[PDB]
Amino acid sequence: TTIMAVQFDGGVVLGADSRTTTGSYIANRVTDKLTPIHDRIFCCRSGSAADTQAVADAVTYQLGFHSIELNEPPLVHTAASLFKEMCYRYREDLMAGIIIAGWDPQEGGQVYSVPMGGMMVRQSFAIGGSGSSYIYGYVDATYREGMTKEECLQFTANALALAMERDGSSGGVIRLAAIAESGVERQVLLGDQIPKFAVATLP
Amino acid sequence: TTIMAVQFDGGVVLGADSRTTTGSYIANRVTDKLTPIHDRIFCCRSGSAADTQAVADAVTYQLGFHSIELNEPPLVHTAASLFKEMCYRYREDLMAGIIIAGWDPQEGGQVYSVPMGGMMVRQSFAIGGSGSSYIYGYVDATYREGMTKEECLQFTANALALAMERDGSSGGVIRLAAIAESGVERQVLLGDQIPKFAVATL
Amino acid sequence: TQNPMVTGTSVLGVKFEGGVVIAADMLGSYGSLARFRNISRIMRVNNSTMLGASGDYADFQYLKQVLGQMVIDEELLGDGHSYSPRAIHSWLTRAMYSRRSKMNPLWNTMVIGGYADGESFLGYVDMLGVAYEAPSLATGYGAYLAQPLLREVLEKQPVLSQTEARDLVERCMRVLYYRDARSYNRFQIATVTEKGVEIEGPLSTETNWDIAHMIS
Amino acid sequence: TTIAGVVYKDGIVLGADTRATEGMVVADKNCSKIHFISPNIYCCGAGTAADTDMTTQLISSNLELHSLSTGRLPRVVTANRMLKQMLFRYQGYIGAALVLGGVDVTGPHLYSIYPHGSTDKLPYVTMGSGSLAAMAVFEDKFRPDMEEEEAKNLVSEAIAAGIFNDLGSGSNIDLCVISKNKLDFLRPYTVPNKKGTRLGRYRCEKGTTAVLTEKITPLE
Amino acid sequence: TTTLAFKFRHGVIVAADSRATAGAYIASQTVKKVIEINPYLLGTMAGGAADCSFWERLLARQCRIYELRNKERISVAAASKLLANMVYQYKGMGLSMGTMICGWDKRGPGLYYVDSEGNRISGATFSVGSGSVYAYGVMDRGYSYDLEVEQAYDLARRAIYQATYRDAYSGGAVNLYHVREDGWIRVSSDNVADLHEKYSG
Amino acid sequence: SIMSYNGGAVMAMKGKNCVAIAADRRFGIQAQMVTTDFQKIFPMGDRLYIGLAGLATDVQTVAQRLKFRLNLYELKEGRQIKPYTLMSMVANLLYEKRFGPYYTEPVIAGLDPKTFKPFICSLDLIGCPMVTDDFVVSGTCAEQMYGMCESLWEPNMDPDHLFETISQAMLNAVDRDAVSGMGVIVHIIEKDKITTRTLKARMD
Amino acid sequence: RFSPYVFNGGTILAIAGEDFAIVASDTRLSEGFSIHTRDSPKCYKLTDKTVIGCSGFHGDCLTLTKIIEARLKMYKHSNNKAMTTGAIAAMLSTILYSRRFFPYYVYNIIGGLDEEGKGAVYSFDPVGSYQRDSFKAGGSASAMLQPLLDNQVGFKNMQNVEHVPLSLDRAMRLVKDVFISAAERDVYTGDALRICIVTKEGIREETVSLRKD
Amino acid sequence: MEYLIGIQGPDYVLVASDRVAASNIVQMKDDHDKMFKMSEKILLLCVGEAGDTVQFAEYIQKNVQLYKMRNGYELSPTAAANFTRRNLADCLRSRTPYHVNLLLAGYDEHEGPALYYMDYLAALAKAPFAAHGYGAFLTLSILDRYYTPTISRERAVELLRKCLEELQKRFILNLPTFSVRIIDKNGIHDLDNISF
Amino acid sequence: MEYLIGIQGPDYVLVASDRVAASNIVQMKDDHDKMFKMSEKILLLCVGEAGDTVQFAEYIQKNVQLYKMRNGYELSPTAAANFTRRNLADCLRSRTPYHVNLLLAGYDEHEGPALYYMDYLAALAKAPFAAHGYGAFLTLSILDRYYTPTISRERAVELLRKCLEELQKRFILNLPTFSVRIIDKNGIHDLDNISF
Numbered sequence A: 001t002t003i004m005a006v007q008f009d010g011g012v013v014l015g016a017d018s019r020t021t022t023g024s025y026i027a028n029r030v031t032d033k034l035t036p037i038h039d040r041i042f043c044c045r046s047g048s049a050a051d052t053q054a055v056a057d058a059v060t061y062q063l064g065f066h067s068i069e070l071n072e073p074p075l076v077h078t079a080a081s082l083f084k085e086m087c088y089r090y091r092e093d094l095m096a097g098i099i100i101a102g103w104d105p106q107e108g109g110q111v112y113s114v115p116m117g118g119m120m121v122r123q124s125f126a127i128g129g130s131g132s133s134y135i136y137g138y139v140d141a142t143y144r145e146g147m148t149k150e151e152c153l154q155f156t157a158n159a160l161a162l163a164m165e166r167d168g169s170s171g172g173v174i175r176l177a178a179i180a181e182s183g184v185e186r187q188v189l190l191g192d193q194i195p196k197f198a199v200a201t202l203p
Numbered sequence B: 001t002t003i004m005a006v007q008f009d010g011g012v013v014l015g016a017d018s019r020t021t022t023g024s025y026i027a028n029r030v031t032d033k034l035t036p037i038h039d040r041i042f043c044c045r046s047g048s049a050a051d052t053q054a055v056a057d058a059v060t061y062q063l064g065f066h067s068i069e070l071n072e073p074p075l076v077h078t079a080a081s082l083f084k085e086m087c088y089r090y091r092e093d094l095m096a097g098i099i100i101a102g103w104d105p106q107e108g109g110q111v112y113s114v115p116m117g118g119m120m121v122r123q124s125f126a127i128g129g130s131g132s133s134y135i136y137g138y139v140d141a142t143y144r145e146g147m148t149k150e151e152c153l154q155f156t157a158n159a160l161a162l163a164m165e166r167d168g169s170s171g172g173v174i175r176l177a178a179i180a181e182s183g184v185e186r187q188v189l190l191g192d193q194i195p196k197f198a199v200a201t202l
Numbered sequence C: 001t002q003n004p005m006v007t008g009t010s011v012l013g014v015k016f017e018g019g020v021v022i023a024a025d026m027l028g029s030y031g032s033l034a035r036f037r038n039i040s041r042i043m044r045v046n047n048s049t050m051l052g053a054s055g056d057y058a059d060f061q062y063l064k065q066v067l068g069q070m071v072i073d074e075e076l077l078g079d080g081h082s083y084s085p086r087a088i089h090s091w092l093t094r095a096m097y098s099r100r101s102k103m104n105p106l107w108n109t110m111v112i113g114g115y116a117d118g119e120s121f122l123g124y125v126d127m128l129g130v131a132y133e134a135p136s137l138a139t140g141y142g143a144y145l146a147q148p149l150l151r152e153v154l155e156k157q158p159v160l161s162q163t164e165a166r167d168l169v170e171r172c173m174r175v176l177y178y179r180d181a182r183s184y185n186r187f188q189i190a191t192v193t194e195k196g197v198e199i200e201g202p203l204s205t206e207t208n209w210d211i212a213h214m215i216s
Numbered sequence D: 001t002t003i004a005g006v007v008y009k010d011g012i013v014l015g016a017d018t019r020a021t022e023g024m025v026v027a028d029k030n031c032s033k034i035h036f037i038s039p040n041i042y043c044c045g046a047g048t049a050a051d052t053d054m055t056t057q058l059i060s061s062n063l064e065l066h067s068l069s070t071g072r073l074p075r076v077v078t079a080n081r082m083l084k085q086m087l088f089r090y091q092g093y094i095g096a097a098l099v100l101g102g103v104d105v106t107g108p109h110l111y112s113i114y115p116h117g118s119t120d121k122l123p124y125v126t127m128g129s130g131s132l133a134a135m136a137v138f139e140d141k142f143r144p145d146m147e148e149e150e151a152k153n154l155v156s157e158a159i160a161a162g163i164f165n166d167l168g169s170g171s172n173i174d175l176c177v178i179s180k181n182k183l184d185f186l187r188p189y190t191v192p193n194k195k196g197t198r199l200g201r202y203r204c205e206k207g208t209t210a211v212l213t214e215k216i217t218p219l220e
Numbered sequence E: 001t002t003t004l005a006f007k008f009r010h011g012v013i014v015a016a017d018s019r020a021t022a023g024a025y026i027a028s029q030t031v032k033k034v035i036e037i038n039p040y041l042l043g044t045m046a047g048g049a050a051d052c053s054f055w056e057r058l059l060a061r062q063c064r065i066y067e068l069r070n071k072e073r074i075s076v077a078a079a080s081k082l083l084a085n086m087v088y089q090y091k092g093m094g095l096s097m098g099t100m101i102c103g104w105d106k107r108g109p110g111l112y113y114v115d116s117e118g119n120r121i122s123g124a125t126f127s128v129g130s131g132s133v134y135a136y137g138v139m140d141r142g143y144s145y146d147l148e149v150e151q152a153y154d155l156a157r158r159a160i161y162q163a164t165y166r167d168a169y170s171g172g173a174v175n176l177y178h179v180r181e182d183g184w185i186r187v188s189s190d191n192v193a194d195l196h197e198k199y200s201g
Numbered sequence F: 001s002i003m004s005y006n007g008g009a010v011m012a013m014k015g016k017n018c019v020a021i022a023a024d025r026r027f028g029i030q031a032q033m034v035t036t037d038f039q040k041i042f043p044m045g046d047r048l049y050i051g052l053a054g055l056a057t058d059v060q061t062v063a064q065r066l067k068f069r070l071n072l073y074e075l076k077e078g079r080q081i082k083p084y085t086l087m088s089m090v091a092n093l094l095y096e097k098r099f100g101p102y103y104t105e106p107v108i109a110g111l112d113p114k115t116f117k118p119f120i121c122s123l124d125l126i127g128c129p130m131v132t133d134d135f136v137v138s139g140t141c142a143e144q145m146y147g148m149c150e151s152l153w154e155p156n157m158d159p160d161h162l163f164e165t166i167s168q169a170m171l172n173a174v175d176r177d178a179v180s181g182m183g184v185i186v187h188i189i190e191k192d193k194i195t196t197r198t199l200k201a202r203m204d
Numbered sequence G: 001r002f003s004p005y006v007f008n009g010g011t012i013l014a015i016a017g018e019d020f021a022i023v024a025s026d027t028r029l030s031e032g033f034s035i036h037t038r039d040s041p042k043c044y045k046l047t048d049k050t051v052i053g054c055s056g057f058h059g060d061c062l063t064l065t066k067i068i069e070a071r072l073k074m075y076k077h078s079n080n081k082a083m084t085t086g087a088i089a090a091m092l093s094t095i096l097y098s099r100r101f102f103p104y105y106v107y108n109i110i111g112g113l114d115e116e117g118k119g120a121v122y123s124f125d126p127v128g129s130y131q132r133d134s135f136k137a138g139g140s141a142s143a144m145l146q147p148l149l150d151n152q153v154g155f156k157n158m159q160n161v162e163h164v165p166l167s168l169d170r171a172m173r174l175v176k177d178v179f180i181s182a183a184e185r186d187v188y189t190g191d192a193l194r195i196c197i198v199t200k201e202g203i204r205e206e207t208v209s210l211r212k213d
Numbered sequence H, I: 001m002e003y004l005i006g007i008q009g010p011d012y013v014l015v016a017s018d019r020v021a022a023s024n025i026v027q028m029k030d031d032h033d034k035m036f037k038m039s040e041k042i043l044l045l046c047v048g049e050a051g052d053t054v055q056f057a058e059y060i061q062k063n064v065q066l067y068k069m070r071n072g073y074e075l076s077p078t079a080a081a082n083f084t085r086r087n088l089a090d091c092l093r094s095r096t097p098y099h100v101n102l103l104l105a106g107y108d109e110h111e112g113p114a115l116y117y118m119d120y121l122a123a124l125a126k127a128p129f130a131a132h133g134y135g136a137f138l139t140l141s142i143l144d145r146y147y148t149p150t151i152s153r154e155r156a157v158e159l160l161r162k163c164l165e166e167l168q169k170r171f172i173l174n175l176p177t178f179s180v181r182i183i184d185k186n187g188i189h190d191l192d193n194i195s196f
Ligand SMILES: *[C@@](O)([C@H](CC(C)C)NC(=O)[C@H](CO)NC(=O)CCCCC(C)C)[C@@](C)(O)CO
Pocket: A001, A002, A019, A020, A021, A022, A023, A027, A031, A033, A045, A046, A047, A048, A049, A050, A052, A129, A130, A131, A169, A170
């Protein structure tokens, strides 16, 4: 797994590979790891499939009820807090590395990391999952303050393609989502649409 | 540790961080991990300091004797083969991930990886050591066929700086070497000379 | 926590005439990976008290949540009594000991600094409930690398000015950055005086790499 | 143990504490940890005491055979190679951690040598359970090209840091100063720790101890 | 530790050494290993010192409650049974205790061995502790139901003594008690160094 | 612990122009005393003794193998061994077994055969030497022995005071150790005589 | 394997006189090969007549002393009088045993006056075994202190010596001597010696410097 | 499980040993002999691990006999004990250690009777009396209680019998018969077995 | 270590048990009784782990006696054996298992004599004869060799004695005396101890 999300002025971009593994067998080649928690709040899931599905379903329930009670769209920070409380309290029994990203009217586009152990931190951009090791350098050299939506989508797709080339545990297609006040726009990059960088064969 | 070497037309560039660790204590903050094996052949060392020093000393001895006997400069491929033989034979007793790079009159600039286990492969460029994990993406996106010497030096210094920022086990100064027919040029990037990329604050 | 995940390294503290200064870098490491490079490991508890934490950052955030709610609860009463630095340190000792005694520690080592009634307070609490006070403290590698320097200065001159304590902390942060492979050259300094608690940062130490050319 | 060394303008200063321990008990209050290698080369030892003694003695002996043969003053590199090759061969089972310093035809040289056989050539080094305390002093205060007295002050400060902050280290500070012109083996350099005085006298008079049997054997 | 006891015509003799150890360190040479449960009942201590003291002190509490509730002395059988039932619940948790309960009740002289493994048994003679093997040898070769009082004291004292000689973990003083029909008495406390002088191959 | 299987204690002590060496007398196997006259101090010269504590089998082997070496040395050289030279011989013997050691930690006490200067030392089980100017201790009650020696020893003691001090240091130390004691033997070494005494001691 | 214990050092001593008790301790608090602080006494005042010395795992020393303090006030409230030295000792035995299966890693020595005004010393193992003693060392250097006390206070192994009563002045000299000797050899014992003298007039305090290495 | 005992008087050494060879829950022999004649005035009593015991004792025996044939006279008890010890100690850290416990009894023309005790580690002690096996735990105190150095040989056999009766009473193992021998100026004598 | 044996004839059951209580290398009691009277015509013989054995047997005993007091008549041997089995089996997977091995002997007015065997797992078997302990390994074949279902009580005591003599000869443990009892239409009778 490789997951990623990036803030822009007015929203967020989220991305993931699509591979589920047991050992080195690919049990699902087209997994959807970006899961909607509310209208404009998604989580990106890494670690245990069972654990992250259970936790996402529970938070969806908690956040949905909270939202009806308040009669308002939920804050992204509230979604992140609910993930954090559950990931922290059950940290000994879960294997879950999460990114929460979305939009709300109060604070705009926001990205939160909830890594294993259940800490929470807001970031400009976040990466996670085992494949993320291989793109720290890339994201650190390539990130620029003030990127547009279209630039965040390219940045994300490029980072994920690189991780997927190197990490046996990541692959398949790239799923992307952009979230803003106007809604959610999802797309898939597959085959020839995935950014491509040569293998450096010998001169 | 992070180590790297890159081929260009007429030579090679080699680079390393300068950190030696025991656990998370830094026992040497200015280690020299690029060791000369002959006039135009170096190795970059990662893994056990004891093991890679012992092996580099032994290969220097073997290659030196071989070279005097033949009355010719040694092949880069020969140096790599000698490393490989020792790293493969003693793979169960050594922790050594080596890059051999240099120049000879027959094949020009060459880079060889001898990773743990003792396989050997020639490459356009090579990275190794624990910090290399964090720059696979970077090097894959940034490498271009046909880079000049000066571009290889920048490419190397950038890759190493990024690794050193993220890997607790790498750091200190960047040591670089360029090798060509005309000789060896060494330099150190320190402090403000190390390439810089912001922490992404809110 | 049985197994710490994202972790912070050393926290330093020193008493000076009129206050206390503490220092901690801004790094959360994930094993050797310098993963979260802009996190604060220092908390303003109330006007007289501050806290710095080494160890598991999620456990630090939990303490911050609990202790933040306790000061709020107390402020609601508006009754002229506030938790002194010493009372906060006592509470912390009990909480860590209690969690140790359930075999489920909070995986932290903490430094509490304060200023109340003309007295500087500096106290240590670890994950087993070991607690004490001293004129200077350093957790983690700081205990080996910084504390010898702090104590040597304090023997020649037990009473330091604010500016002397601040310069001494900066020298220690430099040594830690040279010798601790989980450190990072971006830190905060927090100070407590009569006027309250101030947190400054992000700060960096200058470094010297002359020895790189003395392979001797 | 705290051992350390520095390269100064004209030479080497080596330093050591004088405590040896068995578990958490002091076995020797005045152990000598700075060992003769050759007239121009000395070596501080940390780790397993028998291994530091025997390893330095052996190398010193082989170096004397070397110099007798060459008719020349030995080189610090040669001691370094001999030590590291032997330690490597023993795979870390010889628990000798060494600070090797001397002055040869190519000037001053200082090396740290580890049990597994790695070595680092550096202008200042520390080893032993006190080594991080001593290293903090060096990182804070070392300058290149110090004068003899500055260098001596710095080394003893560093050893003192280990003495007072490491339970494994104690008692006296020994120094060895090596230049082209001079060798000063300063044992002790400083005695910062002193046993307190005895307040009561326990001078037991003859017959206090009851005796079952006695035999006097006269000698020549 | 070495403790012993035996029944005979004139009641029950009870004796013990006085050493305590922590590994090989001698922690004390002056431990009282015979506990006064009431004026006609004694308990002996071998194994873990805290464990013996706590559980025999609790036994003493319970015996006294029993006396107040029932208006009569608890029997040796019942007292030994109360102790056995208390410790049974803790089997396998690492209590270390070996005790003799020694009294004189309506069935006459009484003696029971009780331990943390769950054993409870009546008998004529017992020895317990690391030195018990040595005490048994000497006690066995001298024991008779028809021993005279002074001969019984001599035997008990000598058996403990010989145990302190061979067993590194036993020593100090030999403390001797005699349970008679109208109550126990403390007979003697003799330092093993003074007994060495006196005895006796 | 291998070193406590038999128990035992030795110490040596320096006075003006004399030295003293003392040992407990128990031979036992864990809790069980087997004998109360076991020898742990061995003559290596008229004025030079070695005391060994530790595993009884290695006490005997080291004494015997050391005596083999010393006898050959003295026959070949003109002369009686110096104390410092005996120490070295013993160090060399122990370090030959660096990787499968003898479990014994000796003390040496003697007078130089020509100058009569006092000498004491001890060695660890792999032959690391330590010379001192006051006392040395080895065995299962070393902490007890250190406490007595540190409190009682004074410089420049005459033979009678040296005897009282080493005797009180030994008796009171072993009385806090379950597996050492059953008697104490003391040798006082002077230029013109050796005095050997057994002490009135606890036998528990 | 999280371990809930660490060893923090500390040497304690108590001596009973005819009309006094002494309780003494070093002030070093250690962990591993490091010193936490040089000014951490191991003695705690319980009443006007009773002092307790505690060493071992500092987390437990702190907890246990706070438990004892709470229990002494509870007792005073329910019974209308301060706890005697003997009752404090009996109570401590039960508090230690209550943790029989997760012990307080603490060596305790109580020193105070008994109900006749005489010195009383009680010593404890971690699970609450105890007895009254004339004098007793505990903690890190106890095996170094105890034999010399056996000899000098107990008169053991000495012939033709008058067994005179222990004066305060001699008891004091012995205390300082044995800690000075211990500081030479035990790596954990050092910095300073804190001495509390309990008499009918109250509790007074002496401190003496020890080696800092 | 195996019991050895020795008692040395002024001019003799008395020794005894159980006669059981056991395996798992059964006695497989009830007339087993644990004594080895080394020379006219030397017995070695050997117990311990199966194979090791006989292999070790017979090797010592053959070499003691060889010494006699080579030199015309016998090793003394003390020399034989030290020879036995050198061999055991030399094997201790070898590829072939011998897990045996021993008593050596003898009579020397000039030194009189001797009894030596040796454990598997090869610690050697001279003693006035001694015993090996679990049974030693129950009998050594009986010896400490009643032994005197001038004990006559009759009384030594009585003292021996007290020890053996104590095993019948108190020891959990069934050891019903014992070999008994004595050594003096006139060599080695078989006494009647003591049986129950 | 503990031996139990039972032999059922036409109108009686004969039972015996060793009288040793041992601890480590010593017998601590030689007149120990391993039999518990449950009712006028029922004996329960119990061996196994210390504490467990007495705690279990006395609990069963008290409940069998309680049944008699509540109902005016006694449990049959078969009903008592099944009760005993229910309890042991119910504890087997609990926090408080009892590590005990048992024989239950009885006589019923209508069903005649019965002997039941139970192991610590609580498997219950009715048998014409049975035994527990390591001693069983040496005696069961003697019972298979000589037992017949019409065996008279005289010959049962002789057959019992052959078994006990075999333990003296061949068993490694010292078990010198045994309790012997018989149950028939007239209740429980003590026979002479069989001793060696
Ligand atoms: C991802 O972390 C990925 C994310 C997950 C939310 C789809 N994780 C997995 O594929 C995990 C990693 O082990 N696999 C499972 O939980 C197993 C699902 C089990 C079904 C059968 C195969 C037993 C990456 C990087 O780990 C994917 O490789």
